[PDB]
């Protein structure tokens, strides 16, 4: 009520207006999210022993129609993969502890699948694991996802299944039948899973040798990244052959880090510089590559986070999001602020960053002993933003508010069983 009012006053004052060069430039197009599991931005153009680890994704990165972000950060917490989903579908953060998917599965949401539903978009999630995991079966219905093609829809023979479920290559290949019979325009997300810690892979599935740092999970990380790269290349081939490549916004993104801060000696070797607390913060960059048919792309260096993605996508589709309780801003807008909150209260700006609660020069990596007024102000803005987002989840505030003309999801109308 007055909680709803405080949040909307905050979000509306933050709102960044669309860029006229990009607004609606993909109106009516399909959306295909390619979820790169545990994939960090440092992998892009990375060479292991003279050899590109992820060559197809590198080519996608540089494609003429691709908007490619080099300073884009994950903003997840203990909810991990489920947190990135909360961020992408709602422009809401996960919780400061535990998993929002687990505990807020019966909250009211006004998510991307619902917003695009208003305009006749069909929606679907594809995932090679069972719908019970991370409580997806429950919360997707509140999101208004028309479909959830989970492991029940796939051939889970033991040759094709890993320890998290179906491997990416048979997953993408068996998804084609389902995607091709989905009514267009559609809104879809493909959640991959082979690239999970500690990154095991059979020798015969591996086309690249492990790194040689002596840290097992860092060394085989490159091998599962390469395998994921190859599976994604096959998927895009299908998309080109089926004609979906030309009528869809295809978005590759990473959900969270692959290597933790507990592998400093190995990551020192991998990145060629001392992997200290600052560098570890810098390693929280994940890819964001938005391929838009007919629009000139280019490298995007403006700082941003996963919270900013839904406002960015909606503006590309020609949909205005000003009245929605969403905490991110359009990444292509000139009014987008280059400020990236972490879930623990840390933050990244192009000049100064707070990392582990301490201040650093973002350009040089040098510690700054004392917070200035400006650093303190930014810190409190970040704490305020996270608190208001938490107030939406903890207060279940979307019960009490929807933008005018928005029609709400009836979650009882969805069933994902075969
Ligand atoms: O134990 P580590 O290597 O720090 O990290 C392990 C992963 O974060 C758990 O999935
Ligand atoms: Mg993940």
């Amino acid at each position: 009520s007055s909680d709803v009012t405080e949040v909307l006053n905050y979000t509306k004052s933050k709102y960044a207006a669309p860029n006229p060069e990009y607004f609606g430039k993909a109106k009516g197009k399909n959306v295909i999210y390619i979820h790169l599991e545990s994939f960090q931005q440092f992998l892009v153009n990375y060479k292991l022993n003279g050899e590109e680890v992820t060559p197809f994704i590198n080519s996608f990165f540089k494609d003429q129609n691709t908007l490619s972000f080099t300073n884009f950060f994950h903003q997840t917490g203990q909810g991990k993969t489920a947190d990135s989903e909360m961020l992408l579908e709602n422009s809401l953060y996960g919780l400061p502890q535990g998993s929002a998917f687990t505990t807020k599965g019966q909250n009211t949401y006004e998510s991307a699948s619902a917003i695009l539903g208003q305009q006749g978009y069909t929606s679907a999630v594809f995932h090679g694991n069972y719908k019970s995991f991370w409580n997806r079966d429950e919360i997707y219905k509140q999101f208004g996802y028309d479909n959830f093609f989970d492991a029940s829809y796939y051939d889970m023979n033991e040759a094709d299944v890993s320890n998290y479920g179906l491997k990416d290559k048979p997953f993408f290949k068996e998804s084609e039948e389902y995607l091709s019979s989905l009514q267009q325009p559609f809104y879809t997300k493909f959640i991959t899973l082979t690239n999970h810690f500690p990154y095991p892979i059979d020798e015969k599935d591996a086309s690249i040798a492990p790194a040689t740092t002596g840290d097992s999970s860092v060394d085989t990380y490159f091998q599962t990244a390469r395998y994921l790269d190859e599976s994604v290349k096959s998927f895009v081939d299908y998309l080109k052959k089926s004609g979906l490549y030309d009528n869809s916004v295809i978005i590759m993104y990473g959900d969270h880090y692959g290597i933790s801060d507990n592998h400093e000696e190995a990551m020192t070797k991998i990145l060629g510089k001392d992997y200290n607390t600052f560098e570890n913060a810098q390693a929280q960059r994940v890819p964001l590559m938005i391929h838009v048919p007919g629009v000139q792309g280019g490298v995007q260096e403006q700082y941003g986070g996963q919270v900013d993605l839904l406002p960015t996508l909606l503006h590309l589709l020609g949909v205005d999001n000003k009245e929605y309780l969403q905490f991110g801003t359009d990444l292509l807008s000139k009014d987008h602020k280059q400020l990236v909150p972490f879930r623990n209260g840390d933050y990244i700006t192009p000049t100064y960053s707070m990392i582990g609660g301490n201040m650093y020069n973002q350009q040089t990596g040098e510690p700054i002993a004392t917070e200035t007024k400006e650093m303190k102000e930014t810190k409190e803005k970040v704490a305020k933003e996270l608190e208001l987002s938490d107030s939406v989840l903890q207060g279940d505030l979307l019960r009490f508010y929807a933008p005018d003309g928005f029609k709400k999801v009836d979650p009882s109308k969805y069933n994902y069983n075969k």
Side-chain angles (χ1 to χ4, degrees):
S1 91
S2 75
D3 286 344
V4 160
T5 300
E6 187 180 0
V7 176
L8 185 67
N9 285 334
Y10 178 82
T11 59
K12 285 185 74 167
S13 79
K14 198 187 168 178
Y15 172 81
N19 186 339
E21 151 176 14
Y22 297 106
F23 184 70
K25 281 298 184 68
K27 179 179 194 37
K29 291 210 158 62
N30 302 305
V31 179
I32 301 170
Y33 270 115
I34 300 172
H35 170 110
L36 304 177
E37 187 53 64
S38 300
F39 195 109
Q40 284 166 261
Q41 176 62 17
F42 80 84
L43 286 171
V44 175
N45 293 323
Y46 194 77
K47 281 158 129 285
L48 191 61
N49 206 35
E51 187 184 352
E52 292 184 49
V53 178
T54 63
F56 178 71
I57 285 160
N58 295 344
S59 79
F60 192 81
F61 184 75
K62 78 191 337 163
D63 187 271
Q64 180 199 99
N65 296 122
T66 305
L67 300 157
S68 292
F69 293 76
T70 50
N71 297 312
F72 176 83
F73 293 80
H74 83 92
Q75 301 168 290
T76 65
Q78 296 185 329
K80 293 278 184 55
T81 304
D83 283 346
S84 80
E85 297 195 58
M86 180 61 73
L87 285 153
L88 252 65
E89 301 305 332
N90 297 284
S91 201
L92 302 169
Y93 296 83
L95 291 172
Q97 42 271 346
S99 179
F101 266 38
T102 299
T103 63
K104 305 298 173 178
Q106 300 182 331
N107 273 26
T108 300
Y109 294 99
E110 293 161 14
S111 80
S113 60
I115 290 170
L116 294 181
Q118 307 290 305
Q119 289 176 350
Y121 275 66
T122 303
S123 56
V125 181
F126 300 76
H127 189 51
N129 196 20
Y130 295 101
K131 60 189 191 280
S132 60
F133 284 87
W134 271 139
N135 198 31
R136 285 186 178 104
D137 185 34
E138 182 178 64
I139 200 172
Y140 279 4
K141 299 184 178 81
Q142 302 287 346
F143 289 179
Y145 264 113
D146 293 328
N147 302 278
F148 189 4
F149 299 100
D150 77 327
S152 297
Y153 293 82
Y154 295 88
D155 182 13
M156 301 291 285
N157 65 77
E158 147 164 63
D160 284 336
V161 163
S162 79
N163 270 309
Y164 275 40
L166 191 64
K167 303 177 187 181
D168 293 341
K169 285 174 180 180
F171 166 68
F172 275 130
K173 188 69 203 177
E174 296 168 30
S175 288
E176 293 173 9
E177 143 184 0
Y178 296 122
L179 187 61
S180 280
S181 66
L182 204 63
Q183 186 170 349
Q184 297 180 38
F186 52 61
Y187 170 78
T188 60
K189 181 190 276 174
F190 290 76
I191 308 175
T192 65
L193 64 86
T194 295
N195 203 44
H196 275 94
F197 177 93
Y199 313 107
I201 183 171
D202 299 325
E203 291 179 60
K204 65 184 178 185
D205 293 345
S207 64
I208 195 173
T212 56
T213 67
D215 189 333
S216 285
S217 63
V218 176
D219 287 339
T220 64
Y221 176 68
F222 293 106
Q223 294 179 297
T224 48
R226 161 64 72 83
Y227 175 95
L228 170 59
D229 188 72
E230 288 163 351
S231 76
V232 169
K233 179 190 175 169
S234 303
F235 184 54
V236 175
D237 280 349
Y238 165 59
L239 294 180
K240 298 173 168 153
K241 170 191 172 189
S242 57
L244 288 171
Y245 193 74
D246 296 299
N247 65 359
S248 308
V249 184
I250 299 168
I251 307 177
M252 295 191 198
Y253 73 95
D255 61 337
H256 57 71
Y257 61 84
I259 314 302
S260 74
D261 195 26
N262 299 323
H263 302 270
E264 298 91 334
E265 293 176 335
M267 287 305 288
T268 292
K269 292 181 182 72
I270 291 306
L271 295 178
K273 52 186 167 180
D274 187 56
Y275 196 80
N276 53 26
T277 303
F278 179 85
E279 291 302 328
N280 179 68
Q282 303 311 323
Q284 301 313 303
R285 288 172 171 81
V286 293
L288 173 62
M289 294 169 278
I290 306 176
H291 188 263
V292 188
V295 168
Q296 216 173 81
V299 175
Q300 309 296 301
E301 298 189 296
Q302 59 270 32
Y303 283 67
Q306 289 166 328
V307 72
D308 299 313
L309 196 34
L310 178 58
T312 307
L313 173 63
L314 291 180
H315 284 184
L316 279 167
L317 300 174
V319 181
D320 175 60
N321 72 315
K322 197 182 190 164
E323 301 305 321
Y324 286 108
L325 277 42
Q326 292 172 8
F327 289 91
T329 55
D330 185 359
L331 290 165
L332 300 177
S333 172
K334 69 180 188 72
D335 296 327
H336 171 70
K337 280 51 172 181
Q338 297 192 74
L339 167 59
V340 190
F342 284 9
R343 180 61 262 201
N344 74 342
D346 284 342
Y347 63 81
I348 306 302
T349 83
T351 55
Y352 56 83
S353 301
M354 190 178 72
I355 302 158
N358 300 310
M359 301 310 303
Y360 294 84
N361 186 314
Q362 170 67 13
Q363 294 306 314
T364 72
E366 182 180 14
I368 294 170
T370 54
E371 292 186 336
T372 65
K373 174 271 204 180
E374 300 79 23
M375 297 168 194
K376 175 68 165 170
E377 190 179 319
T378 301
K379 172 179 183 178
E380 297 306 327
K381 285 175 168 177
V382 170
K384 186 60 167 167
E385 177 158 311
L386 293 170
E387 171 212 292
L388 288 174
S389 183
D390 292 341
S391 74
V392 173
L393 292 186
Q394 283 160 349
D396 196 8
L397 293 182
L398 291 178
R399 284 178 308 169
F400 311 124
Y401 175 81
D404 288 345
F406 181 90
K407 312 303 180 182
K408 299 185 97 165
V409 171
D410 183 349
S412 68
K413 305 310 188 190
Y414 300 77
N415 190 314
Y416 303 138
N417 293 286
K418 280 195 67 179

